[PDB]
C-alpha cells in the first residue's frame, strides 16, 4: 500500500552524494517493507551552477517524476517519493495542489526555500522551491499551492529578505522548539496532508545533508509528527537530501535513523 518513487537524475545537485543517498534510502525501504521502487532519471555529476542553467538541465527528470507521482496520487496508495534534492518538489507540489486543492503541505526544512530569482544571493534552485510552488516565480513546472495552505516546520536562520516574502505571502512558520504534535495538528486542522522533508531540518551530526543549520529538530520530533498525523489523512511523503555515499558506513547509519522516524506512517501503510 506504499508506492515508492525514486529520483536519480540531477536536479541542481551541488553536493556529491545526494543521488547515492536517495538510492540507499530507497533500498532500505524496499528491504523493510517489501517494495519495488520506481526509479526515474539518469545520474549526472554535481556542479555549483546557477538555477537558470540547472533548471533547464533537470526538465526530463522533473517531467518523469511528475508523471509517476501523478499516477500514484490518482490512486489509493501512500505516495512516497525519495528525492535526491528538494528541488524535485518543484514538479510534485503543483501536482499535489491540483489533485488535492484542500491539502495542507507540511514543508519540513531548516530553511524557508522561499527565495525568488530577484532575491537569491546563491543562485541555488533548492532555495527557491516553496516560492516556486506557490507561484511567486515561474519555474516552468506549474504552481497552484496556496501559501495559506503551506506550513514551514523547523525553519530557522531565515534572512530578512526571505522572511519578508514569507510574511507577505502568509506562509506560517513553526520553529523547531515549537514543532510538537499539538502545533502540527493545529496547523493541518481538518485537511488532507502532504509532508515534504529536507534532512537539513535536523540538528546537525546525525544525518548528513547539504546544509548545516544549528539548533534543529530532533529525530524524535519528526517521529512524533508521523505518529500524530492520522493515516486516513496522509496523502504522501517526500524524503530529500541524504548526502552520503551509497556504500558508506554513514549511509547505513543514516537510513536506520530515517526508518525509525518514518515508521509510524509507513507501518500503517505497509
Ligand atoms: Mg490516499
Ligand atoms: Mg480526478
Ligand atoms: Mn533546507
Ligand atoms: Mn529544502
Ligand atoms: Mn537541504
Curated annotation (Swiss-Prot):
PROSITE patterns: ARGINASE_2 (PS51409). Mn(2+) 2 binds at residues 109, 111, 198, 200. One of its GO terms (biological process) is arginine catabolic process to ornithine. InterPro entries: Ureohydrolase, Ureohydrolase_dom_sf. Disruption phenotype: Cells lacking this gene do not produce cycloserine (DCS). One of its GO terms (cellular component) is cytosol. The keyword Amino-acid biosynthesis does not apply. Keywords: Antibiotic biosynthesis, Hydrolase, Manganese, Metal-binding. It comes from the Bacteria. It catalyses: N(omega)-hydroxy-L-arginine + H2O = hydroxyurea + L-ornithine. Mn(2+) 1 binds at residues 109, 113, 198. The keyword Hydrolase applies. Its cofactor is Mn(2+). Signal peptide: none annotated. GO terms for molecular function: arginase activity; hydrolase activity, acting on carbon-nitrogen (but not peptide) bonds, in linear amidines; manganese ion binding. Its EC number is 3.5.3.25. Involved in the biosynthesis of the antibiotic D-cycloserine (DCS), a cyclic structural analog of D-alanine, used as an antitubercular agent. Catalyzes the hydrolysis of N(omega)-hydroxy-L-arginine (NHA) to yield hydroxyurea (HU) and L-ornithine. Belongs to the arginase family. This is N(omega)-hydroxy-L-arginine amidinohydrolase. It comes from Streptomyces lavendulae.
Amino acid at each position: 500500500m506504499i508506492d515508492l518513487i525514486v529520483s536519480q537524475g540531477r536536479v541542481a545537485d551541488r553536493a556529491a552524494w545526494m543521488i547515492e543517498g536517495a538510492a540507499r534510502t530507497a533500498r532500505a525501504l524496499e528491504e523493510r517493507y517489501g517494495l519495488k521502487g520506481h526509479y526515474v532519471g539518469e545520474p549526472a555529476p554535481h556542479a555549483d551552477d546557477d538555477w537558470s542553467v540547472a533548471l533547464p538541465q533537470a526538465r526530463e527528470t522533473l517531467v518523469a517524476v511528475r508523471e509517476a507521482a501523478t499516477e500514484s496520487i490518482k490512486g489509493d496508495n501512500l505516495t512516497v517519493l525519495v528525492n535526491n534534492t528538494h528541488s524535485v518538489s518543484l514538479a510534485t507540489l503543483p501536482v499535489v495542489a491540483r489533485e488535492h486543492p484542500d491539502a495542507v503541505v507540511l514543508y519540513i526544512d531548516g530553511h524557508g526555500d522561499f527565495n525568488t530569482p530577484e532575491t537569491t544571493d546563491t543562485g541555488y534552485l533548492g532555495g527557491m522551491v516553496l516560492s516556486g510552488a506557490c507561484g511567486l516565480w515561474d519555474s516552468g513546472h506549474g504552481a497552484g499551492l496556496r501559501p495559506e495552505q503551506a506550513v514551514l516546520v523547523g525553519s530557522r536562520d531565515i534572512d530578512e529578505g526571505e522572511r519578508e516574502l514569507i510574511r507577505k505571502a502568509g506562509v506560517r512558520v513553526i520553529p523547531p522548539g515549537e514543532a510538537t504534535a499539538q502545533a502540527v495538528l493545529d496547523a493541518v486542522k481538518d485537511a488532507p496532508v502532504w509532508i515534504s522533508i529536507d534532512w537539513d531540518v535536523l540538528e546537525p551530526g546525525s544525518i548528513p545533508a547539504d546544509y548545516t543549520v544549528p539548533d534543529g529538530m530532533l529525530p524524535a520530533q519528526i517521529r512524533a509528527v508521523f505518529e500524530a498525523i492520522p493515516a486516513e489523512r496522509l496523502i504522501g511523503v517526500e524524503l530529500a537530501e541524504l548526502n552520503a555515499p551509497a556504500d558508506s558506513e554513514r549511509a547505513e547509519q543514516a537510513v536506520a535513523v530515517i526508518l525509525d522516524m518514518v515508521a509510524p506512517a509507513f507501518d500503517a501503510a505497509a
